[PDB]
Every structure is written in structure tokens, then in C-alpha cells.
Design a binder for this molecule. Structure first.
Ligand SMILES: Nc1nc2c(c(=O)[nH]1)N[C@H]1C(=O)[C@H]3OP(=O)(O)OC[C@H]3O[C@H]1N2
Ligand SMILES: Nc1nc2c(c(=O)[nH]1)N[C@H]1C(=O)[C@H]3OP(=O)(O)OC[C@H]3O[C@H]1N2
Ligand SMILES: Nc1nc2c(c(=O)[nH]1)N[C@H]1C(=O)[C@H]3OP(=O)(O)OC[C@H]3O[C@H]1N2
Ligand SMILES: Nc1nc2c(c(=O)[nH]1)N[C@H]1C(=O)[C@H]3OP(=O)(O)OC[C@H]3O[C@H]1N2
Lengths: 133, 154, 140, 122, 150, 142
């Protein structure tokens, strides 16, 4: 299949409570954790906002109505990093995997934008998902 | 020394004073998967379609919404965007390399990273029916130009 | 200052799917001459304010960080000239069948229509005032 | 309550122009892929483009592109489908129009007087 | 072409080009039955003022051209005009738009998008009455960018 | 021609200051300071929200021009004595177009967020007044 974009038909599916949790990391130098925590709130909003626009960022995703989005951030001085864990949930025909992965990635991008001045090079990753319902 | 105000609060830094130079930034991303997961990409056997073309466009579009995605960034006019997708069977991964350039007052690290991130999120969306536990990463910056701040390479 | 840097979105999967409704209002006070500009010399002006408020309401989830994305079933925005008060009254109506109310949509519809009217008359009068913006009714 | 709608659009050009889409096999490459992605994206934003439309939860968006050298044009056909309270006509026409516009943008450099139309429901 | 030698899709760097006042005119048509055209004129379509609704829809679609059309450059429009006119002799509505800015890349897509989106809107207003409407033709009338046309 | 042809105007430093108020009951203004509003950090969310709104003004107000902002600041300040939150925004850029709508939209969406963050507690909060404080680019203040 060359040059084609097919969107999966979800009409036939049942309405179920679906759920997904992803995680993402922003690794940096130890000092670069000079930390205000509303720096996290900016990143927290960015993930929630990204989660709600996922159908618009990912070309083949469905418009969905999220029941809840939560974005948590943790600083791990022992590992030189910020840990993010996301949670998206709805009751519909479509899972919320991409929403969580997007919400974690953009929260990660946001922290990079906030600290980009101190360290030119920081490493975002890994980005993956813990479990889904 | 941040994207934050003097008080512990969020504002938008005034960039107007600085010099307007041609700026550039290149970033990279990796999508780690199974050998079988990468093999259906080369064969075009994922039911969702052309995975690289879709990830190419998505990142390009992602690039232009960066100021709109990253809450505090300045609106910018990208002059050039390149999103490169490459298959690496030997490491079980797709390597992604992006390139953003414009003539403005504020840097372009975020546009290049964002383009790289969504191309990765897209490649994931396109193949996730086959493998649910793929790993996105690392996401890094490879170079930056035009900035008054410390320029950077490799 | 507890809960600092924190952003919780209320969970709504537990609520019942019912028809929910919200009415909001807004006023834009101006000089009488500015209010005479619209009525005497109103369609192109009220329409812009009408449309802007309707599309704005359809974007409330994009504007209010912690609001739910919902699918609006009806959006009505009426504009009224009130010469006795040197002002323009806006009244909006939002309604759908879902788990989330449509309060913010109705409020946003009113706010943006207000801002739209402000932009339209901004050249004639510098010091126009928007307010009050308050909610009129809710059913849910 | 499965509802469905299909639209179509044409982007008429010179036979020389339509050959740049196929003699580089771009037609089953990125050029058609872009118009296909654009139209799908546009269809999911019909409510944001057309003032009096409702936001809808689409079950499917299809954008098929086919070259008709025989008529000097690219034929476009769209398909929108959902299970809900609102038909999806505007979504199909929007997907159809924007998908045609992307193709104009692609070949805009080659020909300055390309013509889009007709755009109609099926 | 507007894509890569690779056959890859990319956005071309146009920064080297001069910063000139570019302009674009496009026209578009929406053919309907005579009664449907008259309900626009009498303003008896229940949704509301069709031309005014379409005008605004077109203006705003123009400001979103780079965000709708995937490979186009982000631009800052200086002026957008959206003109609506009924032509009873042809059973149709004629749309004529105007875009212009001081930039390094043209504004054709901005005018064409405005014409199509004003046309989609006119369709959406009158759709309840008629499902037979045909949009077209949609074409470019002029360009005075740095890359002259008419 | 209701969308004004902004080119060609002089490229000048343009600035705008706007203000807005969200009146509430003292328990509501108290749970903001306590930060016992369930949705979260109210001022942060309203501060971020107002800022993005400034960058989206061109897309919300039909006849406004697309522009590129340089500075957006959103001030939230609690006024227990007046049972209200005062918002003051400041928008600046260098271009051909003024920034009044941005400052006003930012102030308005920040107000709308504050309403969103506290509305579970109080349904009858009242947003107003929303006005311009200053624009520089002739000049105006007061
Ligand atoms: N917004 C959004 N749209 C989606 C998916 C998604 O995760 N988010 N998964 C895609 C899939 O591959 C399938 O996964 P799923 O979770 O089984 O649900 C059906 C499909 O939805 C598809 N469309
Ligand atoms: N788009 C949108 N999203 C919303 C609310 C809203 O008014 N509009 N209210 C918020 C609430 O506090 C709750 O109020 P509610 O009326 O119980 O409805 C559910 C919730 O929706 C929440 N998210
Ligand atoms: N997104 C979207 N919104 C719409 C319509 C539509 O086709 N798409 N039709 C409009 C109509 O006039 C009616 O068409 P319909 O197919 O009868 O369904 C209900 C109405 O939805 C209205 N709003
Ligand atoms: N984004 C944006 N677009 C705008 C204005 C604005 O404040 N923001 N002012 C509007 C005006 O009324 C005029 O004000 P001005 O500051 O004289 O500049 C020209 C016009 O730009 C208009 N478009």
C-alpha cells in the first residue's frame, strides 16, 4: 500500500469505559533541576490540552470526547530526570492510547521549552504506555 | 534564566529587542519496535496505510502548530521544514530527523523537536495494532543556528 | 497555597447522559453616538458578533484548559440594542445531550460576541466597557 | 443509526500537468497522500470551518484520488460515516473541496490557471 | 514540483526571495434552483443571513489556509476581502475574494480557500432546501506576487 | 472592506494594557488563597489560559489580523476587600497592527478560566468590567 491513508471504521463497536496510562521522561543535568515546583502547571496544562487535540495532531485519529485527563509530574534527583505519567479515560467506541502518548510527549516538550535556556541538550525519552483498559 | 517570570509565574518574554537572524534547528527521534513490527512498514502491510508519508506530513503540520501546542512559545513563521523518516532494521527502529529554519527573533528548537515527536507519535498510531509496547525515544536536538544564545552541534 | 502547579480535570464518565442547558448574558456599554452608529448605519455588525460567539462556543474546550470536549447540539446568540442605556445586550443559549453542562460555552459565546462588537466599534470609541458577563440560567 | 455520505471533486489541468503526477509516480506517492491526509483532517474540522455546523464524532473518513488522463483531470471521491444524530454531507464536501485544494497547491507552480469543479454530493 | 527529489514531502525554503506585496483574486460559483437563489435575496433561509455568514466564514478560512493545507507556509494576511453576489440569469451565487500581504511567499491558497469555504457555507445554509447544489467552478483570477498573472 | 488593509503601516512598537474583574463570594476568594478549589491551581491555569488566548485572538475575532506577539503578561491579584480577582494584561509586539484585542481577549479568557475553576462553589460569579487601560503606538491611558 503506497501513498494511502486509511482510517479504521469504528461504527460497529460497543460503548465501553476505556482507559490508558502512558509515561515519558525528560533527562537532564543534575543542576538543571533548579525547580520552581508554576513551571509544572504549564506542562500539566499542555498535556491536557494536547490530549484534547490528538485527533487534530495525529492524522488518522478519531475525534473523541474525553471523560477525564490527568497529567502528573515528578522530579527524580537520583536519576537526573522528570517523570511524567498520564491518564486518559472515556466511555465510547475508541480507546485513548494516542491521547495519553500525546499528553505525555507534549508535557515533556513543555518542560524542555521551560528549561531550554539552561541546557541546550536534554534528552526526552523513553515515551511508552504502562497499561490500558 | 528561564521561560518563567521574575516571580514564580508564567509570562511571555519580550524578544523584540534582539537581532533578527536566519535561525535553524535540527532534532532527532527514534521509534523502537519489534522486527516484525518494522517489517510490515517496509512491506506496506499495516492496514492503516503509508506510514512514512503520513508521519512525514503530520510532523510538518505539527511543526506549524508548535507555538499553539507549547503554551508559552512565541508565534513564528517557519520558512522551511524537513521531516525525514528512515528504517533501521539493524536496531529495530525508525530514525527520524527534522529540520526547521526561519528568520525571526526567537529560536526554533521547539518546532524541530515537535515535528520529530509527532512523526514518532504518528508512526506509533499507524502500527500500534500490531505492537502495543513500542518505545518512543530518544528525542534530542542535533544542532542550532542564528541564536544569540550558545549555538550547538552533534 | 496548597495544590500549587496542579491541574485536575473532573471525571465525568459516571454521570448520566441527559439534555443540559445554559443561558448567559453580556453587555457592552458605549457612548450614544457609537450606539447610533450600529442601529442607524445593524446586520453586518451583529452577524459578525453572532458568528464569532457561535464558533467561539464550539471551541470552549480549546480555550478553557480544564473543560471537557463536548459536542454542542444548539448555539444561539441574540444581539439587542438598548438606547436607554447606551449599550448592547448579548444573550446566548447552549444546549446538548451529554455528561457535561454547557455553562462555559454559553459564557464564552457571550464573551467573544462582546469582544467582537468591541473590535467593530473600537475606532469610534476608545473606552467602551464590557460587562457584566454573568450566567442567566442552567438546566442539568 | 448508521448515517453515511459520499462527495466528489475534480481538479482539471493540462495533460502535461497530470503527467507530472503520474510520470514520477507521485500519484501513488506523497502528492496524493497529502491530499488524502488534508481532506481527512479537513473533514474532522468541518464544524470549525462552517459556522453553522455541529462538531461530530466521525466513524470513518475516506478520500480516494484517481487520475483521469482521459479527461485531463484528477478525480476525487470522499466518504464520511457515523452513528449519530447528524448527517455528514458537509463533512464529505469539505473533505472533497480541501482535498482538491491541496492538489492545486502541489501543482500550483507548474500551471497558474487550474480549475476546480464540479464539487457535488452523490 | 512542491515536494522532494526523494519523492518525499517537504516544505520549500523561500526565505531568500524578496519581501514584496503579493495579491490574489479568486472566483467561485454555487449553482442552485431559482427559488433557492431568491431565498438568499429575500433572506428567508431559516439559518440566517447567508451572504454575511458566508463572508465571515471565508475571511476566517483565509486566516487558516496554512493550517488547513498541509505543506503551505504560515503567513500574516494584511487584507482579506470576501464578496458575495447573486446572479439570477445563471441560477447561481458568484463569489469573488481578495487576499494580499507583504511577504516572501504568495497568497493564492488564501484566496482559493476563502472562495471554497464561502461556497461550502452557502451550500450549508441552503442545504435543507436543496441537496442538488453544485459548487464550481473555483479558479484563480489574478496574482501580483513576486514569483504577475491575469 | 471591513477587514482593514494594515499594509502598509509603519513598523512600530505597539503595546496594550487591559483589565478585567471576576467578582465572587468571599468563601470562593478564600478557597483560591487556600487553594482548596478542586480543579487545581486557579491562578496558574488562568494565567496560562489567558496567554494562549492572546496568541489565538486572530482566530477568535473574525476581523482581526494575524500577528506575532513578543510579550504577553497575565497578572492575577486577589482583592479580598472587594470580593474579586483583578486581572491586568500587557501585550506588546513590533508590527503594523495594534494589540488591544489581544490584551482584552487574554484578560477575558483568564477571567473565564477563573470562573471555570471556581464555578462548582459558586454558580453566580459575575465577570466584569472588561476595559482597556492603555495602548501605546496616537497614545492613550486612563
Ligand atoms: N483518537 C484516537 N483515535 C483512534 C485511536 C486512538 O488511540 N485515539 N486508535 C486507533 C486504533 O488503531 C484502534 O484502536 P482501539 O483502541 O482498539 O479503538 C479502535 C481504533 O481506533 C483508532 N482511532
Ligand atoms: N465544555 C465544558 N466542560 C466542562 C464544563 C462546561 O461548562 N463546559 N463544566 C465543568 C464542570 O465543573 C462540571 O459541571 P457539570 O454541569 O456537572 O458537568 C460536568 C462538568 O463539566 C466540566 N467541564
Ligand atoms: N457538521 C455538520 N453539522 C450540521 C450538518 C452537517 O451536515 N454537518 N447539517 C445541518 C443541517 O441542516 C441538518 O442536517 P441533517 O443531516 O438533517 O442533520 C441535522 C442538521 O445538522 C446541521 N448541522
Ligand atoms: N490581531 C489583531 N488584529 C487587529 C487589531 C488587534 O488589536 N489585534 N486591531 C484592529 C483594528 O481595529 C485596527 O487597530 P490598529 O491598532 O489601528 O491597527 C489596524 C487595525 O487592526 C485591526 N486588526
Amino acid at each position: 500500500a503506497a501513498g494511502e491513508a486509511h482510517m479504521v471504521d469504528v461504527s460497529a463497536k460497543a460503548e465501553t469505559v476505556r482507559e490508558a496510562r502512558a509515561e515519558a521522561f525528560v533527562t537532564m543535568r543534575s543542576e538543571t533541576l533548579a525547580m520552581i515546583i508554576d513551571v509544572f502547571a504549564t506542562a500539566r496544562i499542555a498535556g491536557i490540552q494536547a490530549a484534547k487535540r490528538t485527533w487534530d495532531l495525529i492524522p488518522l485519529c478519531h475525534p473523541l470526547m474525553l471523560s477525564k485527563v490527568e497529567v502528573n509530574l515528578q522530579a527524580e534527583p537520583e536519576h537526573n530526570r522528570v517523570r511524567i505519567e498520564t491518564l486518559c479515560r472515556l466511555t465510547g467506541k475508541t480507546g485513548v492510547e494516542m491521547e495519553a502518548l500525546t499528553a505525555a510527549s507534549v508535557a515533556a516538550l513543555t518542560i524542555y521549552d521551560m528549561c531550554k535556556a539552561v541546557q541546550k541538550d536534554m534528552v526526552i525519552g523513553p515515551v511508552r504506555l504502562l497499561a490500558k483498559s
